[PDB]
Amino acid sequence: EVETFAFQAEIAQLMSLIINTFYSNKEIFLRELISNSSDALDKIRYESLTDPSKLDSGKELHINLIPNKQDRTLTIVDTGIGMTKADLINNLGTIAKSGTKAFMEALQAGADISMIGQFGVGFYSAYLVAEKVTVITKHNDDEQYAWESSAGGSFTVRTDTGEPMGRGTKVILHLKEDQTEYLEERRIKEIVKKHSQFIGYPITLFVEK
Ligand SMILES: Cc1cn(-c2cc(F)c(C(N)=O)c(N[C@H]3CCOC3)c2)c2c1C(=O)CC(C)(C)C2
């Protein structure tokens, strides 16, 4: 079954701001997603020091960037800690509510959209370039789930029947028609070099067939 949920008012407001505000510096979405992947990788690495069996679902700690011109998607894959069903529906959304309030207050005071990561809501910067975001995730303590939202105040959660991941997260960005530059190899390399050159995990930019 597919379960549909309403975003909390603050989150729906943040999504509308990201989608409707005129802001040309859209490239910052990639550093935000890579930062979340890096944080998830730090988490599983730290937990594995006390419990080595937490790496039975995969020892490799990496980030893959996969462009697909045919599907018009940019996928950010990590072998991080992943997210449980409770993380997807409640936990992260609860943390995001206070972060959103602080961010929108900072914007009113003169801060810009690029500072979004300091408020812990950098994931939502994906809506600067994507019309729809699909999140496939697998945490050691739960099943593989698919979260999805095209904004409009709702998101869906379902058990995923695609290729099993072992552990980690895939953020699938269904790009807006005018944002296809983020599928270009030299554009992605430029963005990674500018904003994500010191990430402590291998970042592999896949090339198109
Ligand atoms: C806030 C927030 C961060 N991430 C998010 C989104 C992500 F894709 C990741 C990731 N692991 O790649 C990630 N990692 C952190 C939690 C576990 O380790 C750090 C967080 C999400 C949110 C949401 O509100 C919606 C969501 C639950 C669909 C996604």
Curated annotation (Swiss-Prot):
Species of provenance: Homo sapiens
UniProt name for this protein: Heat shock protein HSP 90-alpha
Gene designation per UniProt: HSP90AA1
Coiled coil: none
Residues bearing PTM N6-acetyllysine: K43, K69
Residues of the full protein shown: 16 to 224 of 732
Substitution effect: G82D: Abolishes ATPase activity
Region (Interaction with NR3C1): 1-209
Location(s) in or outside the cell: Nucleus; Cytoplasm; Melanosome; Cell membrane
Entry's family note: Belongs to the heat shock protein 90 family.
Binding, ATP: N36, D78, K97, F123
